[PDB]
Every structure is written in structure tokens, then in C-alpha cells.
């Protein structure tokens, strides 16, 4: 689709292998903001949102948490507290015709900027002055959308680039998209280091007689540390304690 109506796809309940994405050299831009691209196969996410569109090669910078700009203000806004990745690749053969590709369209002439992740499908005549422009376009009345030409001989900046941005839900609510890893059986009553679907730590695990309500996934402490967890694959609650330390 185009930046006028960037397509959003929710994906969940996967086993996502981000290494195949990060290893293929096809992409020109592959930049991750809240995470590290090499460390995506170890974390777990609740959901992940893939936003797809096509733009010019100039404003690939505009897809950024801040970075105010024409498209970044009027078409697609990234929240400042962004956690995710941005993928962009030139796709001139797929989207530039000898006669030119003119069906790709993007927004100008909006009354204001956009909220982060806000969609703008409104195609209404713009008002430059104060005319009550009902379907007219005379010297103050602009139709908000303008297109691209996308000639194969264009410069790099005007060529088509297909862009997809992944936004992760690192919310600790029960995860569904988890990277490729091999769950092992759990050992209790021993100071071991554990990885409960992205929740890393080190301590001694034990059965607990505290009853989670069926919707919690882990229990936390006065300090921002976990003291009880819910085991996947068993839906069982485990107490976590630090394995003993002291002075000498």
C-alpha cells in the first residue's frame, strides 16, 4: 500500500526466526531502535505489528521516533519511545515502469501533524485561504493527495523504496511470538540461571503455595524484581529465591 494508508498486520502465535531477516543482504536499511538485531532470537513478545508501505528514497530517514518531516509529520508518525526495527529496500524494478508508476500517492495539505501510529484516509479538498471550497480547486483549494512518478531512470532519491517497520509488544503479558530456542525441563531446589520466555535471572526455584489468579503471568517484589513466575507448558507457579550469599 502507500504511506497515505500504511498497511498494518498483527502477527502472533509464531516462532519467529529474525536471523533469516537479518542475514539476507537484500535490504538497504535494517535498523533497530529499542533492541539489538542480533539479540531478537532470545526475547519474547506479546504481539508484533508489521507496517508496510512504499516511499521515496529521500525520506527513509523520516521513519524514526523523532525526525520531524513532511511524511514523518503528515503521513506516518513513530512514537518517541519506539521499540522495534525499520526495514527498507529499493524496489525500483517492482515499482517503476517505463511509462512511470503514478498510482502511488501520499498526503499533503493537512490541518495539523499526526499522532504516533495514526491513520489518515481522509481525502478532502484543502483550504489555503477562507473559501468554502465544496469540490472546487481554485487557487486556494488543494486536493490533499499528490502522487509519485517513479521512472526507472530517476535519481536514487525519487526511486521507490518498500518499507516495513516491526513494532514489538515487549509487554510482559503472556507471550505468543517467541524466538527459536529449545526449552529444557526445569530443575528445582538448585541455584540455576533461568530464562522464562525472555525473563532472565538466577536463583533457586521451588513450588509455591500462593495462588495466582488465572490471568497473572508472574509476580513481582517491592524492588523491581520477580519473586514468583508462572511456568509455561505446565501453568504452574514457582517461587524464586536468590541463592545464598554473604560476607567472609
Amino acid at each position: 500500500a502507500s504511506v497515505y494508508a500504511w498497511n498494518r498486520k498483527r502477527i502472533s502465535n509464531c516462532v519467529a526466526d529474525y536471523s533469516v531477516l537479518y542475514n539476507s543482504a537484500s535490504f538497504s536499511t535494517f535498523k533497530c531502535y529499542g533492541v539489538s538485531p542480533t539479540k531478537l532470537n532470545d526475547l519474547c513478545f506479546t504481539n508484533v505489528y508489521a507496517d508496510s508501505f512504499v516511499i521515496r528514497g529521500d525520506e527513509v530517514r523520516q521513519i524514526a521516533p523523532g525526525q520531524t518531516g513532511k511524511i514523518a509529520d503528515y503521513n506516518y508518525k513513530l512514537p518517541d519511545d519506539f521499540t522495534g526495527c525499520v526495514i527498507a529496500w529499493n524496489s525500483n524494478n517492482l515499482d517503476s515502469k517505463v511509462g512511470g508508476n503514478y498510482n502511488y500517492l501520499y498526503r499533503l495539505f493537512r490541518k495539523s501533524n499526526l499522532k504516533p501510529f495514526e491513520r489518515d484516509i481522509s481525502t478532502e479538498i484543502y483550504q489555503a485561504g477562507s473559501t468554502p471550497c465544496n469540490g472546487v480547486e481554485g487557487f486556494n483549494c488543494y486536493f490533499p493527495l499528490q502522487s509519485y512518478g517513479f521512472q526507472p531512470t530517476n535519481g536514487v532519491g525519487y526511486q521507490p523504496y518498500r518499507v516495513v517497520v516491526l513494532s514489538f509488544e515487549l509487554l510482559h503479558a503472556p507471550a505468543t511470538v517467541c524466538g527459536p530456542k529449545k526449552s529444557t525441563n526445569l530443575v528445582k531446589n538448585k541455584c540455576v540461571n533461568f530464562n522464562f520466555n525472555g525473563l532472565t535471572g538466577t536463583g533457586v526455584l521451588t513450588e509455591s503455595n500462593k495462588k495466582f489468579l488465572p490471568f497473572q503471568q508472574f509476580g513481582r517484589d517491592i524492588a523491581d524484581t520477580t519473586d514468583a513466575v508462572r511456568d509455561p507448558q505446565t501453568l504452574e507457579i514457582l517461587d524464586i529465591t536468590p541463592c545464598s550469599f554473604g560476607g567472609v
Partner: antibody, heavy 123, light 114 residues
Framework: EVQLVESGGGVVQPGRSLRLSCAAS????????MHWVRQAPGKGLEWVAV????????YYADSVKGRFTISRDNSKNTLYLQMNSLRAEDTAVYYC????????????????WGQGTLVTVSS | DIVMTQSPDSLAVSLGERATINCKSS????????????LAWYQQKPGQPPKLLIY???TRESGVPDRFSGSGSGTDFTLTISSLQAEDVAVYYC?????????FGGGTKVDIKR
């Protein structure tokens, strides 16, 4: 106002590999994507493949995997389809077709059909 | 991919009347950046390669009288023929072009019922 004359064709034995070449006339060949559309006796239309206007991207059909390859000799205005290891179900008239670059992407609906051959599969 | 269900398949309806062929694919083969429904209606007389009737599943192309009419959206589409003539004992098809691999319809062998 396009005429397509397809070389190749005739009876073929299964397990053999050969090729068709379709010469195009009446337009600018190197700026139009090509399609192969099977017209099976009593079945109808079955899409096969597509080659980009410059021939940059190649798409093949699902049940055609492991069988065909399709190239495009723009010099003599020809589309080449090298078919391999044919089966007795693959007898049909395989019409070569010229696209119209009208859709937003580099593929769209088709307008012009050329009269393909009758590669005949039988042992 | 996008598997298409085209109904009905064996139209046997007398001359002059209306008729309608609906199409229902698994995917909603449409686009909103360009409110154009990537889908086409074709027809074929026996002995010839088929002929293009409707593009964008709604819009009429030249050389097409009102004996053909395309419409539809979402994933449901309709080819409506207002009046029948003697040259329209032919097989009708639907065809997607939203996303590869492309698919066709099952066919619709229309005849003037006698």
C-alpha cells in the same frame, strides 16, 4: 494489433525436455510483461508463469514447481519456455499473452493473446 | 494462495433475460491506496483464447456493450448480463491479479436455454 507466432510444439514423450519460443510482432517487446496461460481441452484457463517487462522477476505456478523455466529473448521479440519432464496431463494450447503495465505494481491484467502451440504429451 | 469460488457453473437460461455470476475468493482481493479492486471478468467462445470484459471488477472497457457489467467489492463480485444474444453461448471466468500466484475461475458455460 499484436501477432504472436509460437515455435516448438508437437507430440512429446514424458521424461523429455524441450522448449517453445514465441515471436511477438506489432509492438515494443522489451517493455511488456509476458504470461503463459494453459488452455486445457475441456478444463479451461490455468495460469503458468510471468516474466517482468525487462524480465527482471520470474514467477511460476504452484503445481509447476520442478518442471518449467521461462526466459525472454527480447532481441528477436521472443518468449522462451523450456519445459522438462512432462506428464500426460500437460497437453493443452499454451497461449502466450502480453500484459498491460497499468496496475500499481509490475503485474496486472492481460489484454492480448497469442496463438500458442499444442505440445502433446504421450508415450 | 487465493482460491476462488465462482458460482454458478452451468448457467442454462433462455435468451434476452438477465443473468448474474458471483465470485468469492478466500482473500479480500482489494486495495485502498487506490480504491481499485484488483480483479477482472473474462469470457471465451470455444475455439478462441478468452476475451477481457471487466477490469477493476467494476469498470467497463471499450468494445463492451451493456450486455456485460462488472461490479463488486470486499471479496464478493458480480458479473451481470442484462440481455442475452445469440453469440453469448460461452464460458465466463473470473481472475484475480491482487497478488501472485494468479488464479482463474472455475468457468461458467452459459447457453440460451431452449
Amino acid at each position: 494489433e499484436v501477432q504472436l507466432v509460437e515455435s516448438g510444439g508437437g507430440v512429446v514423450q514424458p521424461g523429455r525436455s524441450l522448449r517453445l519460443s514465441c515471436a511477438a510482432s506489432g509492438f515494443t517487446f522489451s517493455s511488456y510483461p509476458m504470461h503463459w496461460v494453459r488452455q486445457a481441452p475441456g478444463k479451461g484457463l490455468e495460469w503458468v508463469a510471468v516474466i517482468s517487462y525487462d524480465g527482471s522477476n520470474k514467477y511460476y505456478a504452484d503445481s509447476v514447481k520442478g518442471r518449467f523455466t521461462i526466459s525472454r529473448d527480447n532481441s528477436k521479440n521472443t518468449l522462451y519456455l523450456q519445459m522438462n519432464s512432462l506428464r500426460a496431463e500437460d497437453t493443452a494450447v499454451y497461449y502466450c499473452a502480453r500484459d498491460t503495465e497499468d496496475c500499481s505494481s509490475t503485474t496486472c491484467y492481460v489484454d492480448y493473446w497469442g496463438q500458442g502451440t499444442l505440445v502433446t504429451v504421450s508415450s | 494462495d487465493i482460491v476462488m469460488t465462482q458460482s454458478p457453473d452451468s448457467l442454462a437460461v433462455s435468451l434476452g433475460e438477465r443473468a448474474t455470476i458471483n465470485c468469492k475468493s478466500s482473500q479480500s482481493v482489494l486495495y485502498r491506496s487506490n480504491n481499485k479492486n484488483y480483479l477482472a471478468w473474462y469470457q471465451q467462445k470455444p475455439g478462441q483464447p478468452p476475451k477481457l470484459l471487466i477490469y477493476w471488477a467494476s469498470t467497463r472497457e471499450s468494445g463492451v456493450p451493456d450486455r456485460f457489467s462488472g461490479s463488486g467489492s470486499g471479496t464478493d463480485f458480480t458479473l451481470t448480463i442484462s440481455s442475452l444474444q445469440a453469440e453469448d453461448v460461452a464460458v465466463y471466468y473470473c481472475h484475480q491479479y491482487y497478488s501472485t500466484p494468479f488464479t482463474f475461475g472455475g468457468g461458467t458455460k452459459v447457453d440460451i436455454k431452449r
